Amino acid sequence: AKVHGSLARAGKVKSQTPKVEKTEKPKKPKGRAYKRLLYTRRFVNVTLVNGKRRMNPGP
């Protein structure tokens, strides 16, 4: 209805972010290797179930 709203704040919060940079961490494998990595984590070693498996558990 009101089409004449202020356009001034456009791009506020993207401009207001502190530009933290990505950590140069070691690269994970690709292809069949990564599917092996997933299988070891998910099934073989057995993650610490608190009733059920998590994935991405908190501290």
Binding site: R32, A33, K35, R36, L38, Y39, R42, F43, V44
Partner: protein
């Protein structure tokens, strides 16, 4: 204005994409057999589906029917040949009750591992793509290759390549050269 060259999709994606029970059971198979993708599992589900469809369409027809007798035996022998279907089961009924792992167990990758040779499915994929293992005479660098039961004895390392015979590789021929020139003047 050539003839059309035909082609076909070899797989089928599942209907509901985030079923947890499936996703677990799929990664079980990608682990056990050392498969790259879910697409490799989907490939075998699709081949099983065409087989099961074929058998269902014959079991509707009466026993002692030409098309049943002919194609039924042809389907059975074709499975028996690749060693998916065992020698005891040759009814047609038994080809219906036939799981996905019963195809996976006969591909090269696993059949290399199961005959010694590697020590792991993950090693076997390497050996195959690295052109080491060879079926009877010639090299096969396709892990998908379904071994045909009259070829399983004849699997060995190639006449070309190390392990089997021949020159001792690329890295060895550099690593032999560096130690040799260091020792000599």
């Amino acid at each position: 204005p050539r003839a059309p060259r035909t082609y076909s999709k070899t797989y089928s994606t599942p209907k509901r994409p985030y079923e947890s029970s499936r996703l677990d059971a799929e990664l079980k198979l990608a682990g056990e057999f050392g498969l790259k993708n879910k697409k490799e599992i989907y490939r075998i589900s699709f081949q099983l589906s065409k087989i099961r469809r074929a058998a269902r369409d014959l079991l509707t027809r009466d026993e002692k029917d030409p098309k049943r007798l002919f194609e039924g035996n042809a389907l059975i022998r074709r499975l028996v040949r690749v060693g998916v279907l065992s020698e005891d089961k040759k009814k047609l009924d038994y080809v219906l009750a036939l799981k996905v792992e019963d195809f996976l167990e006969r591909r090269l990758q696993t059949q290399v591992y199961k005959l010694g040779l590697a020590k792991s499915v993950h090693h076997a994929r390497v050996l195959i793509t690295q052109r080491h293992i060879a079926v009877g005479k010639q090299i096969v660098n396709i892990p998908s290759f379904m071994v045909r039961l009259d070829s399983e004895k004849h699997i060995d390392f190639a006449p070309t390549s190390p392990f089997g015979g021949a020159r001792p590789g690329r890295v060895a021929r550099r690593n032999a050269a560096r130690k040799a020139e260091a020792s000599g003047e």
